[PDB]
Structure formats: structure tokens, C-alpha cells
Amino acid sequence: HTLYAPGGYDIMGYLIQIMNRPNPQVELGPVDTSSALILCDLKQKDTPIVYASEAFLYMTGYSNAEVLGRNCRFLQSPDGMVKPKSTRKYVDSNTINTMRKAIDRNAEVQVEVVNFKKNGQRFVNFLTMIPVRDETGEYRYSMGFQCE
Numbered sequence: 159h160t161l162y163a164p165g166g167y168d169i170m171g172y173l174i175q176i177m178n179r180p181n182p183q184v185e186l187g188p189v190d191t192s193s194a195l196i197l198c199d200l201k202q203k204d205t206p207i208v209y210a211s212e213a214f215l216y217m218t219g220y221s222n223a224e225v226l227g228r229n230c231r232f233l234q235s236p237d238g239m240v241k242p243k244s245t246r247k248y249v250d251s252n253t254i255n256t257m258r259k260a261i262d263r264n265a266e267v268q269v270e271v272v273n274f275k276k277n278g279q280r281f282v283n284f285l286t287m288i289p290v291r292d293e294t295g296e297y298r299y300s301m302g303f304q305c306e
């Protein structure tokens with residue numbers, strides 16, 4: 159039962175924040191909303207997607223209604239059914255654990271993970287996740303950049 163900020167999210171402000179961060183642990187280069195990206199809420203149950211760019215929806219074949227409010231791990235199965243803590247049968251366990259720990263620590267991370275589109279099409283996702291600070295100054299969200 160994820161809640162969404164009425165009035166939307168400051169996606170542009172966050173992209174600006176990310177490109178201006180002082181100690182980047184991963185180079186991303188210039189980024190904008192023309193690419194596949196998602197913002198998840200670190201402070202809500204199971205760090206749910208609260209925003210997805212059209213590029214992301216087009217890439218994965220899923221609609222807004224189908225991704226919002228869910229933890230993005232569903233992409234790890236061709237049937238979009240992935241329970242938390244479960245042992246994936248098509249994805250590297252170490253990879254999933256790497257994402258998990260980085261996110262838990264607000265640490266930037268970049269990985270290549272196997273994902274599946276809504277029609278079951280397998281693909282390699284070059285994923286980068288960067289923690290984002292909201293108006294309070296503390297990390298509240300995480301922005302993911304997906305690349306096929």
C-alpha cells in the first residue's frame with residue numbers, strides 16, 4: 159500500500175543533485191529524463207517505485223499501473239513474480255545481494271543483472287543506483303538508471 163507524493167516528485171532536481179554530487183563512486187555522465195529511470199522510496203515498506211520514466215516502461219514492457227508501488231525485483235522473473243528473500247533461479251545470487259547491501263547502506267552501486275520484460279524477453283540490465291536526498295538533506299530516495 160505505497161503512498162505517492164501528491165504533486166509528484168522533483169525528478170529534475172534529483173538528476174541535478176546526482177550530476178552535482180561531490181564524491182561520485184561511480185561515473186554516470188550526463189543524465190536526463192529521456193532515458194529509463196525510476197525513483198524508489200527508501201522510507202516506505204519494501205522500498206517501492208514511486209516514479210518510472212516512459213523510457214523504463216517502454217524498455218520493460220510494463221505500464222505505470224503495473225510498476226508503481228512495487229519493489230523493482232519483479233523484473234528478475236519472466237513472470238514478474240519474485241518474493242523477497244527468495245532464491246532466484248535465473249539471477250546471480252551474489253549480484254542481488256550486492257544491490258541489497260548497497261541500497262541498505264545508501265552506497266552507490268552499478269551492476270549487470272538479468273531481467274525479463276513483461277513478455278518474458280530476457281535481457282541484461284546495466285543498472286546504476288544512486289541515493290538521493292530530499293529537502294531535509296537526508297537520503298530519502300534512490301534513483302535507478304537502467305540500460306539494456
Ligand SMILES: Cc1cc2nc3c(=O)[nH]c(=O)nc-3n(C[C@H](O)[C@H](O)[C@H](O)COP(=O)(O)OP(=O)(O)OC[C@H]3O[C@@H](n4cnc5c(N)ncnc54)[C@H](O)[C@@H]3O)c2cc1C
Nearest residue numbers: 198230231233242243244245251254255257258300301302
Ligand atoms: C532505485 C532502484 C532501482 C532498481 N532497479 C532495478 C532493476 O531495474 N532491476 C532489478 O533487477 N533490480 C532493481 N533494483 C533492485 C531491487 O529492487 C532490490 O533492491 C534487489 O533485488 C536487492 O534487494 P532484495 O530485497 O531483492 O534482496 P533479497 O530478496 O533479500 O535477495 C538477496 C539474495 O542474495 C542472496 N544472498 C543474501 N545474502 C547473501 C550472502 N551473505 N551470501 C550469499 N548470497 C547471499 C540470497 O540467496 C537472496 O536470494 C532497484 C533498486 C532501487 C532502489
